[PDB]
Paper text:
Crystals of variants containing a Trp at position 189 were only found after a long incubation time for Pre-4 (Ptl-[name]/[name]/[name]/[name]) and Pre-5 (Ptl-[name]/[name]/[name]/[name]/[name]). Mutation S218D in Pre-5 is involved in the S1′ and S2′ pockets but has no influence on the structure. The structures of Pre-4 and Pre-5 each contain three protein molecules in the asymmetric unit (molecules A-C). In both of these variants Trp189 is involved in intermolecular contacts which are different from those in Pre-1-Pre-3. In addition to the role of Phe189 in crystal formation, we observed that for both Pre-4 and Pre-5, crystallization resulted in at least one substrate binding site occupied by a peptide sequence. Variants Pre-4 and Pre-5 crystallized in crystal form C containing three protein molecules (A, B and C) in the asymmetric unit. The structures of molecules A and B are highly similar with an RMSD (root-mean square deviation) of 0.3 Å. They have oxidized cysteine and an unoccupied active site like ligases Pre-1 to Pre-3. In crystal form C the structure of molecule C is more different with RMSDs of 0.6 – 0.7 Å to molecules A and B. It has an oxidized cysteine and a bound eglin fragment (41′-46′ (SPVTLAG P5 -P1′)) that was used as a crystallization aid. In this crystal form C, we also observed a crystallization artifact; part of the loop from Ile205 to His217 of molecule C is forcibly drawn into the active site of molecule B, mimicking a peptide substrate.
Residue numbers in the entry: 1 to 75, 85 to 276
């Protein structure tokens, strides 16, 4: 039944909830596989599809974007989620689709973009779009990737790897890096990403593992901070999260450490 992530307490969102800050009026674009807006535990504020063969962003056959929505709302329950569908049934999207998604978020005045997606390769056009979003004042959050460690190599995927993006890696209930959490100098912060229980299509609930759930907590945290400091820039929101993180291990593996949204929202 009504599953709340252990990660909501781990990042200290309850401190903000009890001050009456729950991400009210903050527009968050979930750029992903869609959101089952059927689910009676989710609010969805609107959406768009850039998958040519799947015009419905409110149908989630992959079941990924529905899980993403629940975790963002578990952290920021009165945020306005927008279902920006850029991934098809095979679980991938063309760069053009993802870019159309980012352009859509810019044109429709999103405060936060969550990208629980990545590839091994970037494009000039993807980097341009992401940089443009951040230049226009959008907080852009992305999953660091699930490619683990690879000796001395960065394994952080695009677009998390871009400096303009907040790359999020995954820890468990003990603040230990998940072994599949991508690593490298481009990694910014960590959040819970192991057995994260959230909403699934058809009024269901279930655990997922990944940097996807980790980034969902950070996107929610951005929404809480802007709830309380509506006049903060994306720059100030990003600084608050990075400078107040609980230091864990070396920054190659853990970046700045675990986000503390309570500490971030005083800063």
């Amino acid at each position: 039944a009504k599953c709340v992530s252990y990660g909501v307490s781990q990042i200290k969102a309850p401190a903000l909830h009890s001050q009456g800050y729950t991400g009210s009026n903050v527009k968050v674009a979930v750029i992903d596989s869609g959101i089952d807006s059927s689910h009676p535990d989710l609010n969805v504020a609107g959406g768009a599809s850039f998958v040519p063969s799947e015009t419905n962003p409110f149908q989630d056959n992959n079941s990924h974007g529905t899980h993403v929505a629940g975790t963002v709302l578990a952290v920021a329950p009165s945020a306005s989620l927008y279902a920006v569908k850029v991934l098809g049934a095979d679980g991938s999207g063309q760069y053009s689709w993802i870019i159309n998604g980012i352009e859509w978020a810019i044109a429709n005045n999103m405060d936060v973009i969550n990208m629980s997606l990545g590839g091994p390769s970037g494009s000039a056009a993807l980097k341009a779009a992401v940089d443009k979003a951040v230049a226009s004042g959008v907080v852009v959050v992305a999953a660091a990737g699930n490619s683990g460690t690879s000796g001395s190599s960065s394994t952080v995927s695009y677009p998390a790897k871009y400096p303009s993006v907040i790359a999020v890696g995954a820890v468990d209930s003990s603040n230990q890096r998940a072994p599949w959490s991508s690593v490298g100098p481009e990694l910014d912060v960590m959040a819970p990403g192991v057995s994260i229980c959230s909403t699934l299509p058809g009024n269901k609930y279930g655990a997922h593992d990944g940097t996807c759930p980790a980034s969902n907590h950070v996107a929610g945290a951005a929404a809480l901070i802007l709830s309380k400091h509506p006049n903060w820039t994306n720059t100030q929101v990003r600084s608050s999260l990075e400078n107040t993180a609980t230091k864990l291990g070396d920054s190659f593996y853990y970046g700045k450490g675990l986000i503390n949204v309570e500490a971030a929202a005083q800063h």
